[PDB]
Design a protein around this ligand. Sequence first.
Ligand SMILES: Nc1ncnc2c1ncn2[C@@H]1O[C@H](COP(=O)(O)OP(=O)(O)O)[C@@H](O)[C@H]1O
Ligand SMILES: [Zn+2]
Lengths: 105, 508, 105, 110, 210
Amino acid sequence: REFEPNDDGDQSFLDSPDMQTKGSENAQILEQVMNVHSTPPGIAESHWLGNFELLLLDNSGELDNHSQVLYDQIKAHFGIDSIELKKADSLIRINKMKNKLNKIR
Amino acid sequence: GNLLSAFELYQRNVGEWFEMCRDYIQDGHVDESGIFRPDNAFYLRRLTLKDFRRFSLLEIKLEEDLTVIIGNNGKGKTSILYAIAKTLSWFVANILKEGGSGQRLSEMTDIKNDAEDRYSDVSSTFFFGKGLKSVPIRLSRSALGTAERRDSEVKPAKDLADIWRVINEVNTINLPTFALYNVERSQPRREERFDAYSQTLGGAGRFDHFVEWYIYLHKRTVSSSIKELEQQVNDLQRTVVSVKSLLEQMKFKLSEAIERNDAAVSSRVLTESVQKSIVEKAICSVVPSISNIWVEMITGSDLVKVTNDGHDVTIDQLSDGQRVFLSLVADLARRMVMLNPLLENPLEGRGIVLIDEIELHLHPKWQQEVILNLRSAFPNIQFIITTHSPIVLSTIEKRCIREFEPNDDGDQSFLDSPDMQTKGSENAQILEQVMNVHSTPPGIAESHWLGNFELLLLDNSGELDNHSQVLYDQIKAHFGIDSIELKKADSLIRINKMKNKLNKIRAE
Amino acid sequence: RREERFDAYSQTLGGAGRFDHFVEWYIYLHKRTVSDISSSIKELEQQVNDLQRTVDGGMVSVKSLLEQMKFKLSEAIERNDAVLTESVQKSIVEKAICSVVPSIS
Amino acid sequence: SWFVANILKEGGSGQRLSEMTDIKNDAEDRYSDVSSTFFFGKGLKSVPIRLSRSALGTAERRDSEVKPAKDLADIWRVINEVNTINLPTFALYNVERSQPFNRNIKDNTG
Amino acid sequence: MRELARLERPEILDQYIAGQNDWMEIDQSAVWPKLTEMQGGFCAYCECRLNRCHIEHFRPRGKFPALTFIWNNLFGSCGDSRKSGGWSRCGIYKDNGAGAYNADDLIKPDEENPDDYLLFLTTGEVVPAIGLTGRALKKAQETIRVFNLNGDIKLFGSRRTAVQAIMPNVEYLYTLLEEFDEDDWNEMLRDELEKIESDEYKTALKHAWT
Ligand SMILES: Nc1ncnc2c1ncn2[C@@H]1O[C@H](COP(=O)(O)OP(=O)(O)O)[C@@H](O)[C@H]1O
Ligand SMILES: [Zn+2]
């Protein structure tokens, strides 16, 4: 039963969540039921992968000087075996392949 | 620049040695960021525990700024903080009084129950600049009924505390803050400078104390030579009906000025107006979603009010978790202002602050914010904290973290940093890689279905057989049509179909 | 609540009175009267007028205080200007006490 | 509290709403109600209880309606007196449960 | 956010006239099936699967009482006036939460293609598209802000998670471009882009695939 009162503290009914919680991942419950980001928004490093992606898309998928610097920062901070670095690597691979297709066309 | 030698020469004799001691304590610089930095930092460097509670032998190296201790219930996180607080009690006692006695280990509870040698040792090494690189202290206790007693070694703590006390007596200096905030923080004469050390290592950070104090400060600071003030009081007295309130205010101001004049160098303190302002700034800087705090008396009762998430509300509208945190910060700020009167920003003073279970009573939302600003508001405090929260850990660098291994039977020698970087990482990863907790509850059958579904797909060369279809339908029925679990299942089907198509093309 | 009208019946036949309730109620009345800005303006206006008379009488030492009070008055007037029943209640009780209790003026 | 009181004693009183803290400050009607409905098998599908309190000086009093709870608690009490039966457990565990332990423990008064 | 094709107008809007009639009067079950034909059972702005859903006036009835019973102006948005909890994106937030906005500086998905203005990153943010200036930037920015397409944690989460589920399949297709002839690989991508019309957050999945 979810208790979200108004600014005056008054509420009429308590609702069940829309998502099934039993056996679900905790990260999903955080976001879908407790309304909290799974990654801390106040930490700059939380935005690096997003920024990295945007830089890659701005330079037609090629690692420029700026994108390389940020890549190196991600590698240095999260480590060689980090999920974040794997995602970055994935982004590079996909975008390079997409660009190659675009050039063929 | 050996501080102890300079002080010994001062005590035997004289102005030059005094000045050297005072400069060692007081000299500092403002860094690039505009923050004052003492030239000679004070912090706990190392802690060793021998046959103490669950620990046969444990060694911890601490960070200068922030150390976070993590582990399951009963791993000894609170025990570590208790050990440090007892050690710090010896500094506090001797700053207050020559030959003052700090606290001691319990002979009933603190000795490890299966210690063959029936005594316990808590050994701490402190650092105070390059002049005093090592200040070792040992607290010891022998078990009840042991023939041979083991003595604590506290003289270095006393010696250092003596320097602070004696130099301060002659000329006011800034003093280190020591505070412990345990889980009990949640439970429901004029002000002297050294009241800052009262109940600092137990009893600190109660909401009621703050509210009372804050209203008091407000009433005093609602609405200047002594001779001039004396003349003004005399002129107002001669005039005295409508000016009687003003006369009483001026008499109070005169009395305060005389008191300050009469008060000693060792108890020199900032004005109540300044004290109030600094604490308000501390609260608003540190406490998440409080932007403003003030006292109203319009309704006819004294109310502390706050601007919480952009709405002006009474402080009694805050959750218990948010009140307890506000109390902690207010209390800390108050002590720092009293102990650091010579600093432009008194919150840039030195000290060691211990916090047990920092996330106590906090909703996940404010767990994501609490540590961000603590270090920015108190830049020269060494914080030693304990937590169970992955959300808190997501805001802290791995170098600050010390973790107990899950299989630790109390024999292990060192606490170490986790392998994975926590700061900026996803919650699920911290849970699995740092806290050893699965993303789905193992005790629920449905938690295994997607994993099992994947295995079934892989067993049947990627084709959706009768068994895989049944489980798919179960997943769909239980979690729903737009569930993450079902989407992952769908993804698996699609990728396996594509893999098989590739395999057929290659075979032909 | 001491301001609630029917609190007047609280322990009324207990034998002692409730002098504690009086003191609480009286402080309450005071806070409300001080918080009312127009009475504060009127009081401040009266204080400024009294201080101006003293400065006109040759006491140059109180000129600094007059300037401070004039500033406070101007600020109070500038703040959004609108008789408190609480003010009248307070006056009635004060007069009663002073009239009946001989040593208290 | 009304079940517990009446299992212990005929005519036992449970707890009451406060006139000071329990009534909403801006209530037009100037009274408060806490209404509960309990289930006890298909033979007693509805056991309604209401706890009420009015503000001082209101023209009408709002009284609590506790009789069904008392009647049910009386069955448990009386039947138990004649022949032992199993009885329901009621308990509240607040955040107050986190308190320190007094190691020194009292002799068996009985 | 999708490019919508508004094609046929329902009969009931002819009967009711602005000024005389109120929106409380009109029957809503007549209006829905034409929107559900346009919108595919998905939200106009965010691309939820609609289950708690309302009719939204793109230009509101307060500011524009002339534009009330107009087939252009109506859209099926996620959310509900009735049920407890203040809904925090789309229709409901545009009115209550977004506050001050010029309705001229918003993407109208029946009229315009959103794809030239909006970009969906695979990390789950929606951002202005690569290289916009002046008005084109200002529409992209205000659409994102007013419909709360990033700031609704529930929405930001759902979209991020939906995309991250498919990113093994995207990765894997663009490896096989090496080996196959063009017409087979172009059929594969055509097939995957066909599937995602049945899916939630279809625009964000497109940008991942294409
Ligand atoms: N004297 C002792 N001898 C042995 N084990 C002890 C002793 N005192 C406490 N313990 C153990 O220490 C643990 C409690 O440590 P504590 O710091 O309170 O845990 P936590 O890490 O949860 O804060 C428990 O496992 C308890 O059994
Ligand atoms: Zn929507």
